């Protein structure tokens, strides 16, 4: 929980869903749900995204 990347892309719009790509990098800031995590895009936008549609980085 700190750095995750999407390998399925989705692009929501933000303000409710962090738009990612099929291999985008993000950071885990909050986690209200279990399936959706509040990660921040490289832009610094706090939005929820699917954990199954993304992974973690090292």
UniProtKB/Swiss-Prot annotation:
Top-level division of the source organism's lineage: Eukaryota
Signal sequence extent: none
Expression across tissues: Ubiquitous.
Location of this chain's protein in the cell: Cytoplasm; Cell membrane
PTM notes: This leads finally to the down-regulation of the Crk signaling pathway. Isoform Crk-II: Phosphorylated by KIT.
SH3 domain mapped to chain residues: 1-58
Subunit annotation: Component of a complex comprised of SH2D3C, BCAR1/CAS, and CRK. Within the complex, interacts with SH2D3C (via C-terminus), and BCAR1/CAS. Found in a complex with ABL1, ABL2, CRK and UNC119; leading to the inhibition of CRK phosphorylation by ABL kinases. Interacts with ABL1, C3G, DOCK3, DOCK5, MAP4K1, MAPK8 and SOS via its first SH3 domain. Interacts (via SH2 domain) with BCAR1, CBL, CBLB, PXN, IRS4 and GAB1 upon stimulus-induced tyrosine phosphorylation. Interacts (via SH2 domain) with several tyrosine-phosphorylated growth factor receptors such as EGFR and INSR.
Role noted for this protein: Involved in cell branching and adhesion mediated by BCAR1-CRK-RAPGEF1 signaling and activation of RAP1.
UniProt free text on domains: The C-terminal SH3 domain function as a negative modulator for transformation and the N-terminal SH3 domain appears to function as a positive regulator for transformation.
Family: Belongs to the CRK family.
Name of the protein in question: Adapter molecule crk
UniProt organism field: Mus musculus (Mouse)
The organism's taxonomic lineage, starting at the top: Eukaryota, Metazoa, Chordata, Craniata, Vertebrata
Residues of the whole record sequence present: 134 to 191 of 304
């Amino acid at each position: 929980a700190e750095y995750v990347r999407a390998l399925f892309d989705f692009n929501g719009n933000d303000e409710e869903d962090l738009p990612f790509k099929k291999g985008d990098i993000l950071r885990i800031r909050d986690k209200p749900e279990e399936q959706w995590w509040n990660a921040e895009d490289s832009e610094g936008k706090r939005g929820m995204i699917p954990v199954p549609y993304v992974e973690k980085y090292g």
